[PDB]
Design a protein around this ligand. Sequence first.
Ligand SMILES: CCCCCCCCCCCCCCCCCC(=O)OC[C@H](CO[C@@H]1O[C@H](CO[C@H]2O[C@H](CO)[C@H](O)[C@H](O)[C@H]2O)[C@H](O)[C@H](O)[C@H]1O)OC(=O)CCCCCCCCCCCCCCCCC
Ligand code: CLA
Ligand code: CLA
Ligand code: CLA
Ligand SMILES: CCCCCCCCCCCCCCCC(=O)OC[C@H](COP(=O)(O)OC[C@@H](O)CO)OC(=O)CCCCCCCCCCCCCCC
Ligand SMILES: CC1=C(/C=C/C(C)=C/C=C/C(C)=C/C=C/C=C(C)/C=C/C=C(C)/C=C/C2=C(C)CCCC2(C)C)C(C)(C)CCC1
Ligand SMILES: CC1=C(/C=C/C(C)=C/C=C/C(C)=C/C=C/C=C(C)/C=C/C=C(C)/C=C/C2=C(C)CCCC2(C)C)C(C)(C)CCC1
Ligand SMILES: CC1=C(/C=C/C(C)=C/C=C/C(C)=C/C=C/C=C(C)/C=C/C=C(C)/C=C/C2=C(C)CCCC2(C)C)C(C)(C)CCC1
Ligand SMILES: CC/C=C/C/C=C\C/C=C\CCCCCCCC(=O)O
Ligand code: OEX
Ligand SMILES: [Cl-]
Ligand SMILES: [Fe+2]
Lengths: 107, 336, 80, 449, 37, 342, 37
Amino acid sequence: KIDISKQGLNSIQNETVKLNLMGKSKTMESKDWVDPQGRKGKGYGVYRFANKYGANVDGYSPIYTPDTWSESGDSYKLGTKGLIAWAGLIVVLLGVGINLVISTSAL
Amino acid sequence: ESTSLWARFCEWVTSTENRLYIGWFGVLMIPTLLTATSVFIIAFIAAPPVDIDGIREPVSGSLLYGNNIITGAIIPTSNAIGLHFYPIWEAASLDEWLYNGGPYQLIVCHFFLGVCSYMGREWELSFRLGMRPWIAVAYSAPVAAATAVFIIYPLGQGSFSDGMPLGISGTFNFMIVFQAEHNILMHPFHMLGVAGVFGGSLFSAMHGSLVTSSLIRETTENESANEGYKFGQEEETYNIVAAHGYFGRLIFQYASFNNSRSLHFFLAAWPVVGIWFTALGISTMAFNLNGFNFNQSVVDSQGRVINTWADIINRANLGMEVMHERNAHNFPLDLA
Amino acid sequence: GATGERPFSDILTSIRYWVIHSITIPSLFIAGWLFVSTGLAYDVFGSPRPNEYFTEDRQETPLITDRFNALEQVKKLSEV
Amino acid sequence: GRDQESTGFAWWAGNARLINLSGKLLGAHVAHAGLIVFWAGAMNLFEVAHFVPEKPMYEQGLILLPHLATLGYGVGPGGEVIDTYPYFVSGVLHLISSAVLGFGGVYHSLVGPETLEESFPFFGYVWKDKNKMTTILGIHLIVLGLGAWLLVWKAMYFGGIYDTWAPGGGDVRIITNPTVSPGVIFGYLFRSPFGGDGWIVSVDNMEDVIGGHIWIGTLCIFGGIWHILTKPWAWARRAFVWSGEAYLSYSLGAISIMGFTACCMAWFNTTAYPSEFYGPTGPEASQSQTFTFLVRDQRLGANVASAQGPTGLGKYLMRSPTGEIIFGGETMRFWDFRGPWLEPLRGPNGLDLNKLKNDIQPWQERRAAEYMTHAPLGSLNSVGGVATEINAVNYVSPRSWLATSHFCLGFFFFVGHLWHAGRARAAAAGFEKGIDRDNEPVLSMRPLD
Amino acid sequence: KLPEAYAPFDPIVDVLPVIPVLFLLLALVWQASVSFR
Amino acid sequence: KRGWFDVVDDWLRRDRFVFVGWSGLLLFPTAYLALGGWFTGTTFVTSWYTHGLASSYLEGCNFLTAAVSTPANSMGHSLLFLWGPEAQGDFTRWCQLGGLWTFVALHGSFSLIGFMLRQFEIARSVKIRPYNAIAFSAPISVFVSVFLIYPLGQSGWFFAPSFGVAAIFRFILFFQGFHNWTLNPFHMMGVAGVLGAALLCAIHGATVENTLFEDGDGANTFRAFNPTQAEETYSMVTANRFWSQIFGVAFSNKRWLHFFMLFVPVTGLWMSAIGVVGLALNLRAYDFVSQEIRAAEDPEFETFYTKNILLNEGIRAWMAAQDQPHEKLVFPEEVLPRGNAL
Amino acid sequence: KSYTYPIFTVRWLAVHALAVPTVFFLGAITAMQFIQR
Ligand SMILES: CCCCCCCCCCCCCCCCCC(=O)OC[C@H](CO[C@@H]1O[C@H](CO[C@H]2O[C@H](CO)[C@H](O)[C@H](O)[C@H]2O)[C@H](O)[C@H](O)[C@H]1O)OC(=O)CCCCCCCCCCCCCCCCC
Ligand code: CLA
Ligand code: CLA
Ligand code: CLA
Ligand SMILES: CCCCCCCCCCCCCCCC(=O)OC[C@H](COP(=O)(O)OC[C@@H](O)CO)OC(=O)CCCCCCCCCCCCCCC
Ligand SMILES: CC1=C(/C=C/C(C)=C/C=C/C(C)=C/C=C/C=C(C)/C=C/C=C(C)/C=C/C2=C(C)CCCC2(C)C)C(C)(C)CCC1
Ligand SMILES: CC1=C(/C=C/C(C)=C/C=C/C(C)=C/C=C/C=C(C)/C=C/C=C(C)/C=C/C2=C(C)CCCC2(C)C)C(C)(C)CCC1
Ligand SMILES: CC1=C(/C=C/C(C)=C/C=C/C(C)=C/C=C/C=C(C)/C=C/C=C(C)/C=C/C2=C(C)CCCC2(C)C)C(C)(C)CCC1
Ligand SMILES: CC/C=C/C/C=C\C/C=C\CCCCCCCC(=O)O
Ligand code: OEX
Ligand SMILES: [Cl-]
Ligand SMILES: [Fe+2]
């Protein structure tokens, strides 16, 4: 019912984090998998009815989908000149603010 | 087939076919609880007046001695005894035993042992039925609260007379004297406990209303939906997705719980932590670590005092402090 | 899914967002500091400064007794 | 590290991923020990730097310095601090050793061997191997016994420990004749916990403390030797759950009991916790108040013995429920108190009327007044006095801090023991992850009535 | 107080005991940087 | 959709991050104004001229002791508009006279009305039943009876709760000292309802979380669920058997379970509201006449009820002088009730 | 695919109406801490 590829989780660099966000783990479906305490697995995986319902709750309602992120915003259009102007403005504003705070107080 | 007497007894005690589970913790639980119940009923109905303050001023608490249900109580042990063990066989006679406040100590000890065994038996049946053993951990919060009000506070105050009476008006008196002496309302742990109970009521109503609002139609209008649910059925009887959609449009999408397991864990965790913290606050205040004292904190330029709601609360505390025991004090400081 | 707005994770990790908001938040903080320090807070909402709690006329707490002359009574009580 | 993909444990339960990793677990434990030593050293340095000599120890919010004072370090007759250099030495040594411990922990956690069962067979273990676990338990029992004997040697040969009951005022004595009588040692252990008895909290001389420490050191060494050479019997294999979480739950329960005992000892004891460095106890302040009011009213020409209160019981002196002469008022509940400044005025049948009528000393009066004014009452923001007082005094007793903190810790570790014992018992059986839909145990039982 | 030879280093001592709490916060920060895998 | 109503309804009932709806026009402005009024009153506005205290951060109060104070008792039950015959359009003197309390209360009541309307509207848009909207009636009744009906039956707004922490604590202590509120059966039902609701929440959470099903291989059981699944995630049969053998009785109906969960706190709060409505006219269950007569005739009869009566008397006598400045009570130190040596 | 989102929405106003006065009041309260009686 749920297509994992259409959930917008394909733009994640870390493979382990990507598998975590879809509620999937290739290691756990193996019949010889043993968790830290030492209990064998029954082959269910993360979710027993993963095939019946498509995916898990993690793969149903994700809260971090880089695919839906805006194409812009990963690069600043104003470039280096904008950053230089911002640096000048923030230095000037910090100086003005500290001067106003000192002047209006009782020294 | 069991043959030995002990093997048969163990099989019967640890049986899951009994109407009420006995277990090995129930072996301790049943007699102590029955003893405390019997003594409580008999003392609540027909017990003589008890000298609670040790100043030869008996206080009546029995129905047969002119009391109703709201007024009746079981008066704590005498102040003269203190923290000393006062079993029934340490008295010259039952008349002397009833005059000093023995039944309170008896009931308190048996009740403490019984509630500890009750929590143990909860774990035991969880293990025998194949469940996960944390309903007993949930019960630890009321167990700790009862222990704090019945054991730890007398332990830190040096007498069982400062313990909570086994009555209604006695409970109110305990609360008022506790406020007058420790300023419990200003304690952050009491604030956390109040938040715990208020949030528990909020979330109980919220969950009940959300589940009742998403019932799938399986009946007609001349019968209740409870008849629409069938015991032991396999399919879910309400729409979790519909309830989540309603709540996420009520506040916003990422505030509701899409996971039923996570939602029920949150429901379990909130009040339990709240009650844990309020019991810890009572136990801490037993050793005289009171709440915030913002008295005469706001001071103007010339040094005079500007009052505050904290100062009004202090005036009320002073009012209920000079009267909590009229004749039991000979010296100006209540150091106990 | 999504209701048709930019994700909060996308916005909060933007150079444009942190360039715009490296000015607005400190500007508001400084504006509040100047509002308090310049004495505007006392004058706008009528709160007493530490030296104005008691005047030379009355050395007790104020008390308002008239409902319809309340404006004039509170004007008289606040006199410095 | 690891991740939920290959472990099944989330980040909030990430320390459970190193249950079967011996090297990383050892690194974590060593790092934690380094943290403990670091806190000890840093707190000692913080307290030594903020100490003024014009005020007593309990008036400045110190909790680690009174521990060194009771060992006879930098203190003099009467309980007055003379030298403050040994405290600095102890703090510096702890802080420096914490660096070595932390480096060892970091090494063993980051780049050390991950599982030391193939390269270091002596240090390797399996949680289900009973013999190895018992051997480790025996080794650590021997270490603890050596520590107890190290404490014993201090009170005998290396200058002794502070004794608050010493003749001519409290002073650093040397314990030459410890009490090693089996009847005395067993009397404290199997005593009732109620009033008057007090269990082990009622130890009232340093000879008993040193004798009990001799006993505990010998017992720990013998038990360690016994466990190194043996393995659990059938009746022990039949009763316990054998896994790391089970062992953790056992330890949690033991240390919860220890925390409750420490809280009670801090609140009630006066021998191992002298009032000169910790301030008066609960009962001590009330007894001091009654004593000083009796002294003042006697100085004004009054008959304290025959004075009658509003209730007709006695304003200053009355009789305990067993007959002993005790102080009157609401302090009649604290008649079990026994302190160095009050014992000299007490006879075989209680307080001696002639002694407190003609032989009361100014030092006793000063101690009573000081312990009356510094009562262990306060608020959360450190305001001394009852809850209906004003903001004048910045004081909370060191007994209150220790008692409250350690009761909270003991309760939380009891809850932790419950959690871990339940989880271990369930996981060993094999249903800690839920019920099996295919084979549900309840569906196979006959229905109830 | 500290000995006269250790007087200049008093400000260092006054901030030491918060380091364990900083260690707990640092563990949380490391988990966040690892992205809670 | 061509009409004005149709296009306005299309825009208002849109799918959005924050749902506005037709009830938003009443909810959002009033709620925003109430929140802003409370924050402004706690941060800048004082309480010197109406109560004789300091109730702001500007004057040196923390989060606990800061509040928005009620008007003076001379103002009676005046609604105290900014343009009314008392403030007469002066904002500073309106703030000084205590008009921010009535502002906050009057906007908060309409915000509550708007919130219930929003619940109704959202429930109808999603095509479910309005039981969540029905459940809000208990908080609304509590607010109405405590903040409006009780002051409306008293001397004025001066005896209403003030929007603060320590102010609410003073209100509670006043209710104990003067009304004997702890001895009211309606308050007893309210306490029972609140505590039972907390009990139900904790017990249901624990029982569901400890009767789960094995739907995965990991120890973290939160990841073995899917909201669109059909089968239930926990064993109702196992839960019922456990609670039948432990307690004696247990639930066998999920719908009845959850309706009981809804029913308990609502009934408790409604009963407490009825009690406060009764108390608004000083109709207090204060004393037992038989006990008073017996204690008067026999100087040896004493119960905990008489001790509570004495405590209430002390509270009244020692709080009256400062809590009610309008009465101008001057009490010599020898008329205040007092115990021995305390 | 390319995703384009509006800058100013109802959510923008809802966020800012609670964010701007919060920062202003926090600055005022911080200034309040250094006033001497
Ligand atoms: C083997 C299993 C147990 C067998 C026995 C079980 C009995 C159960 C009976 C039922 C009631 C419950 C227990 C009540 C305990 C009351 C303790 C008390 O009145 O007092 C406690 C005593 C203190 O004893 C005091 O000891 C004092 C010591 O005397 C002397 O002490 C000094 C000696 O130098 C000074 O000289 C001093 O002046 C002098 O008085 C005095 O004697 C006091 O009168 C005396 O009361 O402490 C101690 O025994 C030390 C610590 C005891 C354990 C911890 C207690 C606190 C925790 C409670 C339980 C856990 C709660 C939290 C979890 C809740 C959920 C599960
Ligand atoms: C969204 C709805 C809303 C609502 C329901 C309220 C409700 C209330 N406000 Mg709030 N208020 C709001 C938004 C709202 N406010 C806004 C946006 C602001 C701007 C910041 C304020 C600012 C404010 C102030 C400054 C005060 C209040 C106060 C009050 C009360 C006003 C009493 C009054 O007589 O009203 C007016 C009476 C009515 C019945 C109006 C309805 C008349 C109908 C529409 C007929 C129209 C006919 C008319 C002859 C022709 C006009 C049309 C033509 C001009 C175009 C009332 C509790 C007062 C207060 O709380 O005192 C303690 C007060 O002091 N409010
Ligand atoms: C009491 C302290 C404490 C300690 C000693 C440990 C110890 C350990 N943790 Mg646990 N943990 C803790 C608290 C602690 N944890 C808390 C509070 C949480 C919840 C956030 C976790 C959650 C957690 C997870 C989720 C995981 C671990 C794992 C690990 C182990 C592997 C370390 C590693 O791979 O990453 C170390 C990573 C880094 C390279 C960061 C290095 C930073 C260094 C160590 C800081 C200390 C340096 C100090 C400033 C200077 C010392 C130098 C000396 C000369 C003075 C390690 C033994 C991992 C595991 O399970 O292994 C199988 C893992 O998966 N832990
Ligand atoms: C660090 C603490 C410590 C721990 C955790 C253990 C743990 C264990 N011990 Mg060891 N042991 C220790 C120290 C310790 N021991 C010491 C110091 C000694 C010397 C006395 C012994 C001597 C010892 C013996 C002789 C035996 C064990 C056995 C066992 C196992 C059974 C568990 C059990 O106690 O039953 C649960 C406990 C009980 C049912 C009741 C015990 C409580 C006693 C009776 C209280 C009264 C104390 C007693 C009379 C001693 C006198 C008091 C003192 C003043 C002299 C378990 C592995 C058994 C075994 O498997 O050996 C291989 C066994 O037979 N231990
Ligand atoms: C050894 C055992 C130790 C613990 C013993 C506990 C004993 C108490 C048990 C009480 C059961 C009473 C239930 C009645 C009603 C009844 O028959 O319940 C049975 C009911 C059955 O539920 P079903 O799912 O079968 O209902 C189906 C629907 O169609 C109903 O319409 O279950 C519950 O509601 C559980 C809630 C009980 C809540 C009871 C709390 C305590 C009540 C107050 C006690 C006052 C004491 C006063 C003394 C003076
Ligand atoms: C692994 C891990 C972890 C942990 C860690 C730890 C726990 C560590 C520790 C560590 C440590 C624990 C360390 C320590 C260090 C120390 C040092 C480095 C010291 C120094 C010192 C000094 C330098 C001194 C000086 C002086 C002197 C000599 C004298 C006086 C003065 C003074 C003080 C100045 C965590 C959590 C992160 C997580 C991940 C993993
Ligand atoms: C130093 C000192 C001293 C001494 C001490 C001692 C010598 C001690 C000992 C101690 C001891 C010697 C202890 C012991 C304990 C024990 C215990 C605590 C036990 C427990 C047990 C248990 C818990 C069990 C359980 C069970 C059962 C019952 C059934 C089956 C199962 C099981 C096994 C689990 C004195 C006081 C003189 C003085 C001061 C100082
Ligand atoms: C009055 C009035 C008005 C209005 C106004 C408004 C609307 C305002 C608003 C305002 C606002 C809107 C404000 C706000 C504020 C806020 C704040 C001040 C906050 C604070 C916060 C805090 C302090 C936090 C804390 C914390 C932390 C840090 C941690 C965790 C927990 C918590 C979260 C608690 C008008 C003109 C129209 C008209 C006339 C009257
Ligand atoms: C005080 C009155 C109470 C009495 C209850 C006491 C005992 C209960 C009766 C019998 C105990 C169990 C005997 C063995 C039953 C059969 C066990 C089996 O064969 O499995
Ligand atoms: O007894 Mn019951 O309350 Ca404990 O404080 Mn003191 O004593 Mn009596 O007064 Mn307060
Ligand atoms: Cl007294
Ligand atoms: Fe539910």
